[PDB]
């Protein structure tokens, strides 16, 4: 030779089954000072020229692997005690990168893969049989590292198909593999991170069903928190660090109602959809909370935080959110919380809140089935005004007075029998053009009310004021119409005494009010006074008019002759005359009557 030619023959021809130490002479010889049979050696070496010990040793390992597949480490003696640099790091790397993982796989799975087939194996099926911590430490990493196959493995194995996160154990493997891929990567890094974000993005729902969620979310935030400013996955979905922080903060502090995927979709929905999703979240959570305050406080940390903008509900203002919430709390009859919220975000005298409160006052009002202070709907109507009172005086102006008053007469009215059909407070509004019709019904059904002008009178004027019914000095007239009704029902109840006092007081009010009122009293009301003058008590002893009553009746009729329609002067006079004659026929001195 050529030493090439000396080594080549020694590589093929020396019996594959000899102990490797019998070849140690070949290395030391490096560490310091039929002729067509060559066709066969190069047949075996495949025309490979065999230039030095290291070249020799890969070739000899392979040629003996042929016959002793069960022992890939056969030639470990020859490379272990090698003196300075007779073997390049290339050789040792192969040992660490191929032979050792190969052996370990073989001797784990009771297999005997040959080094050559092991190397030429599609990496896809290579990883695939690696998968059915020791395994990752001294099979997977050494392999990935040697072939520089990190990005490859990550892409084909570290993805959403392999990591459904449906099971605790899968999750736990997701984290193990993450950690050691992270370790062995320092541009395949962005693929690892892109895939962590991809895995979480599609399988958050499976993850949220796992155990120790809260702990798992912390574990994940541990990792995520190190990722770059921006990450891209899948379609062309891009998430920033600030978004990821708030998303995760949302899941950890506030709610797992929405998956990661759903959260992202809310990010890109229209204002309208977002608001809807927002109130849904509030209503659902308010209804699960031990205490609404705990969920409010969590929202103050995240999605209702005035200190920073919301990267989840991106298209709706603090105001719209708070409004939505007040509407939810009103329907929930959570008046205390409504107050707290109004105070916190300083909504005092806010027009929009005013109108919401008022709208709900009427809702409760119209829903009430009676006016008593205890009726649940009246209670809520009341609680709604106390809020208007505490936090909306300015904007309410005179309107609070009215509403407070309308509630009051509602309570009073429900203490009496009404049969205008029970009687809903909402029916009161229906009588706005005929308030007296309500008073008439009361006087009829409540047989002692005619004696209580003071209260029937505050009802009537309460109804005028509460419903903002006009009273153009027509309140003199109104009082009168009210009083004639009382006379009507006093007679109905056989109480001439009360009838007469009222009748006398009415004539006076009208005398002062002047001639206008006196004609009106007459043209409208003469029949009441005629009837009083004609009144007969069935219970009268002997069916005889008591003398004192005769006299009173005569006087009412005579007062009536001043103001009654001229058509009625005959019959009024006739009665007067009838009473005068009976009177002239009694012994006033020893009077069997009065």
């Amino acid at each position: 030779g050529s030493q090439s030619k000396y080594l080549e023959i020694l590589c093929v021809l020396w019996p594959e089954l000899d102990d490797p130490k019998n070849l140690l002479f070949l290395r030391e010889l490096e560490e310091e000072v039929y002729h067509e049979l060559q066709e066969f050696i190069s047949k075996k070496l495949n025309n490979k020229t065999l230039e030095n010990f290291e070249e020799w040793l890969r070739e000899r390992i392979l040629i003996c692997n042929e016959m002793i597949p069960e022992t890939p480490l056969l030639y470990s003696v020859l490379w272990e005690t090698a003196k300075s640099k007779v073997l390049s790091t290339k050789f040792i790397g192969w040992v660490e990168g191929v032979l050792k993982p190969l052996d370990h796989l073989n001797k784990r799975l009771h297999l005997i893969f040959k080094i050559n087939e092991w190397e030429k194996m599609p990496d896809s099926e290579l990883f695939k049989i690696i998968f059915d911590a020791d395994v990752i430490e001294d099979e997977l990493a050494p392999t990935l590292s040697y072939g520089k196959k990190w990005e490859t493995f990550i892409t084909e194995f570290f993805n959403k198909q392999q990591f459904s996160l449906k099971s605790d154990t899968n999750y736990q493997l997701f984290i193990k593999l993450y950690y050691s891929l992270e370790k062995g990567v320092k541009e395949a890094s962005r693929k690892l991170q892109s895939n962590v974000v991809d895995i979480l993005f599609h399988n958050s729902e499976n993850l949220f069903n796992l155990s120790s969620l809260t702990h798992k979310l912390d574990e994940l935030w541990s990792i995520l928190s190190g990722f770059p400013d921006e990450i891209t996955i899948e379609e062309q979905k891009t998430i920033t660090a600030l978004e990821m922080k708030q998303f995760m903060e949302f899941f950890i502090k506030c709610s797992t109602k929405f998956s990661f995927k759903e959260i992202f979709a809310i990010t890109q929905e229209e204002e309208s959809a977002q608001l809807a999703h927002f109130s849904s979240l509030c209503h659902e959570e308010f209804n699960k909370a031990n205490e609404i305050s705990s969920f409010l406080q969590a929202m103050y940390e995240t999605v209702l935080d005035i200190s920073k903008d919301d990267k989840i509900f991106t298209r709706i203002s603090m105001d719209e959110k708070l409004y939505s919430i007040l509407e939810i709390l009103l329907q929930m009859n959570e008046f205390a919380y409504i107050e707290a919220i109004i105070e916190r975000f300083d909504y005092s005298n806010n027009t929009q809140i005013y109108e919401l409160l008022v709208k709900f006052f009427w809702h409760f009002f119209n829903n009430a089935s009676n006016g008593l202070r205890k009726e649940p709907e009246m209670k809520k109507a009341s609680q709604t005004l106390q809020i208007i009172q505490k936090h909306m005086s300015q904007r309410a102006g005179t309107n609070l007075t009215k509403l407070e008053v309308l509630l009051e007469i509602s309570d009073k009215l429900s203490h009496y029998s009404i049969n205008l059909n029970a009687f809903k407070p909402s029916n009161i509004l229906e009588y706005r053009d005929c308030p007296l019709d309500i008073i008439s019904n009361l006087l009829e059904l409540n047989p002692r009310l005619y004696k209580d002008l003071p209260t029937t009178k505050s009802l009537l004027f309460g109804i005028y004021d509460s419903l903002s019914i006009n009273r153009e000095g027509q309140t003199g007239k109104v009082e009168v119409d009210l009083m004639v009704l009382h006379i009507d029902y006093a007679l109905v109840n056989l109480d001439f005494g009360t009838a007469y006092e009222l009748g006398k007081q009415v004539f006076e009010i009208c005398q002062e009010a002047g001639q206008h009122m006196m004609k009106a009293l007459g043209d409208e009301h003469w029949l009441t006074f005629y009837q009083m003058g004609k009144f007969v008590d069935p219970n009268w002893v002997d069916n005889e008019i008591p003398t004192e009553i005769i006299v009173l009746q005569m006087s009412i009729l005579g007062r009536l002759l001043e103001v009654c329609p001229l058509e009625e002067v005959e019959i009024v006079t006739s009665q007067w005359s009838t009473l005068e004659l009976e009177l002239s026929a009694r012994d006033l001195v020893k009077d069997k009557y009065a």
Binding site: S555, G558, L566, V569, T573, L588, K590
Partner: protein, 295 residues
């Protein structure tokens, strides 16, 4: 026939309007008219009833005859009923309405009404006095020894002096005053006392003291010439002597004519009430019936 009816109703209305048209300050001011003083509304009112005939003329009579009287009476009645509520002093009104039918004696309804109204107020005055007097007398009957004079001294007498009599003076009709005094003395006091079951010595003295206070309150000197007024007080005064006299003085009084004003039955009744039966009461009673008999 139904045309006439419509016109009569329309002028009937014109009259009621005319009454309503009388200014309010006419029922309160007084004018002198011949001297009597009437309320000012009186002259306006008079026109209403004249104008009523005037309005009858505008369809005559004959066309009005069948209803004339009713509608006339009705209008007087309406007027009376109305003005009754307008005139404060029941006594001015009596004079006011009296002036009306003196000037126009066609208003028969008005005089019937006015006088029946007069009777009512007299009866009210009588009723007040009847009760006071019956009360005082009951008080006396039941508390001989130490009777309470309060009814008479604080209620009856002041009532008469300060209320009833000055009220009745206003009517300018001394006949009415005389009727009241006659009623009080005979139908009230004397009749009441005559019906006691018996009249004790102490009660007789009490009753006499009562009569003297009573006379004090029935003194209306202006009536001193009227015979029924003078005789009413005389009988009371003589009853006062009888009530406190011994049997002998009663016979002497009889003899001197002092019981001129007493029917014989009434004299015997007083004696039976005031004295226990004895030979003396008998002879005295039989003597009085006898001398009166011979007369």
């Amino acid at each position: 026939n139904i045309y006439t009816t419509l016109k009569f109703e329309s002028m009937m209305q014109q009259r009621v309007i005319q009454i309503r048209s009388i200014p309010e300050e006419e029922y309160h001011e007084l004018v002198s008219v011949q001297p009597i003083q009437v309320s000012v509304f009186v002259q306006s009112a008079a026109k209403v009833f004249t104008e009523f005939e005037q309005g009858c003329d505008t369809i005559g009579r004959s066309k009005v005859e069948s209803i004339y009287l009713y509608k006339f009476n009705l209008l007087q009645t309406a007027f009376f009923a109305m003005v009754s509520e307008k005139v404060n002093d029941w006594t001015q009104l009596y004079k006011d309405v009296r002036y009306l039918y003196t000037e126009n004696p066609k208003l028969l309804q008005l005089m019937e009404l006015n006088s029946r109204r007069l009777d009512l107020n007299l009866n009210l005055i009588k009723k007040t006095i009847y009760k006071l007097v019956n009360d005082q007398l009951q008080e006396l009957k039941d508390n001989e020894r130490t009777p309470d004079w309060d009814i008479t001294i604080s209620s009856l007498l002041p009532y008469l002096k300060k209320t009833a009599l000055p009220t009745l003076y206003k009517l300018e009709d001394n006949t009415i005053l005389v009727a009241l005094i006659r009623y009080i003395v005979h139908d009230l006091v004397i009749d009441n006392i005559l019906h006691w079951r018996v009249i004790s010595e102490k009660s007789s003295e009490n009753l006499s003291e009562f009569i003297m206070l009573l006379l004090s309150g029935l003194e209306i000197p202006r009536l001193n010439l009227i015979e029924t007024y003078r005789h009413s007080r005389e009988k009371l005064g003589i009853l006062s002597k009888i009530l406190t006299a011994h049997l002998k003085d009663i016979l002497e009084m009889f003899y001197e004519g002092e019981f001129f004003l007493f029917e014989t039955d009434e004299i015997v009744q007083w004696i039976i009430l005031l004295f226990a039966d004895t030979p003396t009461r008998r002879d005295c009673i039989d003597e009085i019936r006898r001398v009166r008999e011979e007369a």
